[PDB]
Amino acid sequence: ANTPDRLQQASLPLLSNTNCKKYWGTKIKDAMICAGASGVSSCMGDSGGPLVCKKNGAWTLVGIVSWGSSTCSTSTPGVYARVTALVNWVQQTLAAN
Template structure:
């Protein structure tokens, strides 16, 4: 079983009415995804990238109009590092008051994983009521 260590710690969830992590916060994403989008396979070791939260309009300007950035999404990156293929489902965590908060789940981004284009994450705060209901069912 997993234990809390220097490297492994639980992350908090934000309630739907708490202050959001908006543009300017520098957060971290982790995963075993590719470091080169043109090379198949995943990495042998877990990688971490520091990625700043990007406002929606700036994020939207990086993608075709077919890909709408919704309020239930949060964008991060475009500052020299990014998530890539194989990182999907991984965490986007932000530090506040000495606690890490699970702000997003790696979802999608630029097909070539360009480091100057933000990645798009599911904004967990948009689903906090649903998550609370599921956890309170205690069916596990």
Template sequence: MVCAGGDGVVSGCNGDSGGPLNCQRNGLWDVDGIVSFGSGLSCNMIKKPTVFTRVSAYIDWINEVEN
């Protein structure tokens, strides 16, 4: 798992499950996470980050199934 957001400005919200956490490296965008869950209280709450499934933990399986 990886957490992102929780700054009170940008965070996941209801209906975001399955959405991407995109990160830019060397001018290219990668999907680093997939929304798993967030605070059930409200959207963009301070100190309540969105929790993502870490794609790198499953990349070997993804590549195997994809091919």
């Protein structure tokens, strides 16, 4: 395997959960969002980092790198924690601490 010294990036598309389930079945939950299957893949060591989407001039955290193909296949969608499902938890926690 090859680990990079320098920070990497990739553009990739969001998938719908209904379509992502054609790859991953009932593993896909509402608090997940799939992205990729596009010729790139997140991989071991990327976990916890960002999936960001740009709108109105700013990048927003839409996903957190979570899991996917055990071989980082570029034709299989990656699975990310779906930040919209989790953000009420985030703002509260920052509320309180």
